[PDB]
Structure 1
Amino acid sequence: KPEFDPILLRPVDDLELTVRSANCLKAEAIHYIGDLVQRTEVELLKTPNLGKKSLTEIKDVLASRGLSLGMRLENWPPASIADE
Structure 2
Amino acid sequence: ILLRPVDDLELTVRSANCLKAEAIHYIGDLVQRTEVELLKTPNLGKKSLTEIKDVLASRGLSLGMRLENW
Establish whether TM, by shorter chain, passes 0.5: yes
TM range (shorter): 0.7 to 0.9
Runs of 4+ more than 4 Å apart: none
Matched, 1:44 2:38: yes
> Following the alignment from structure 1 to structure 2, what is the Cα–Cα distance between the partners of residues 23 and 36?
15
State the TM-score, normalized to the length of structure 1. Answer: 0.75
| Aligned-pair identity (%) | 100
What SS does structure 2 have at the residue aligned with 1:30? Answer: coil
Gaps of 5+ in 1: 1-6, 77-84
Note the C-alpha offset of 1:67: 1.0
Over the aligned positions, Cα root-mean-square deviation in angstroms equals 1.1
> Which has the higher relative contact order, 1 or 2, with Cα contacts under 8 A spaced 6 or more apart?
2
Aligned residues: 70
> Following the alignment from structure 1 to structure 2, what is the Cα–Cα distance between the partners of residues 22 and 37?
16
Note the C-alpha offset of 1:9: 2.8
> Is the radius of gyration larger for structure 1 or structure 2?
1
> Following the alignment from structure 1 to structure 2, what is the Cα–Cα distance between the partners of residues 23 and 73?
26
